Amino acid sequence: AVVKCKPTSPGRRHVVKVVNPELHKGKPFAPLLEKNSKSGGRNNNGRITTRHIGGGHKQAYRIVDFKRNKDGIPAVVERLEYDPNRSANIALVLYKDGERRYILAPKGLKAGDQIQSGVDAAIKPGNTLPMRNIPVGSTVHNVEMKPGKGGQLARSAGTYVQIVARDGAYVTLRLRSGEMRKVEADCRATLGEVGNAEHMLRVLGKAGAARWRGVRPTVRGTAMNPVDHPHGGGEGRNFGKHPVTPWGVQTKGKKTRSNKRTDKFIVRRRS
Judged by CB under 5 A, the chain residues 209 through 238 that form the site for Mg ion are 210, 215, 217-218, 220, 222-223, 234, 236, 238
Q: In the window 50-79, what residues touch Mg ion (CB under 5 A)?
A: 52, 58-59
Q: How remote is the C-alpha of 84 from its chain's centroid?
A: 12
Q: How remote is the C-alpha of 211 from its chain's centroid?
A: 20
d(CA 18, CA 21): 10
251 binds Mg ion per the rule CB under 5 A: no
248 binds Mg ion per the rule CB under 5 A: yes
Q: Closest separation between CB of residue 119 and RNA, Å?
A: 14
Nearer to RNA, 85 or 122 (CB): 85
| 222 phi, psi to nearest 5 deg | -65, -15
Q: Closest separation between CB of residue 72 and Mg ion, Å?
A: 24
252 binds Mg ion per the rule CB under 5 A: no
Q: Closest separation between CB of residue 233 and RNA, Å?
A: 9
d(CA 212, CA 172): 40
Q: Closest separation between CB of residue 249 and Mg ion, Å?
A: 8
Q: Closest separation between CB of residue 169 and RNA, Å?
A: 7
Which is nearest to 86 in space by CA: 105, 113, 112, 69?
A: 105
257 binds Mg ion per the rule CB under 5 A: yes
Residue 158 interaction partner, one of RNA, Mg ion, none, beta carbon < 5-8 Å per kind: RNA
CB of 94 closer than 8 Å to CB of 75: yes
42 binds Mg ion per the rule CB under 5 A: no
- Residues 6 or more apart whose CB falls under 8 angstroms from that of 66 comprise 142, 150, 151, 152
Q: In the window 85-144, what residues touch Mg ion (CB under 5 A)?
A: none
47 binds Mg ion per the rule CB under 5 A: yes
d(CA 182, CA 179): 10
Left (φ > 0), alpha (ψ -120 to 50) or beta: where does 91 sit? beta
Q: Closest separation between CB of residue 254 and RNA, Å?
A: 4
Nearer to Mg ion, 14 or 110 (CB): 14
d(CA 71, CA 116): 7
264 binds Mg ion per the rule CB under 5 A: no
Nearer to RNA, 41 or 130 (CB): 41
Decide: residue 92, CB within 10 A, 0-12 exposed, 13-18 middle, 19+ buried. buried
| Site residues, Mg ion (CB under 5 A) | 38-39, 47, 52, 58-59, 210, 215, 217-218, 220, 222-223, 234, 236, 238, 248, 257, 259, 261
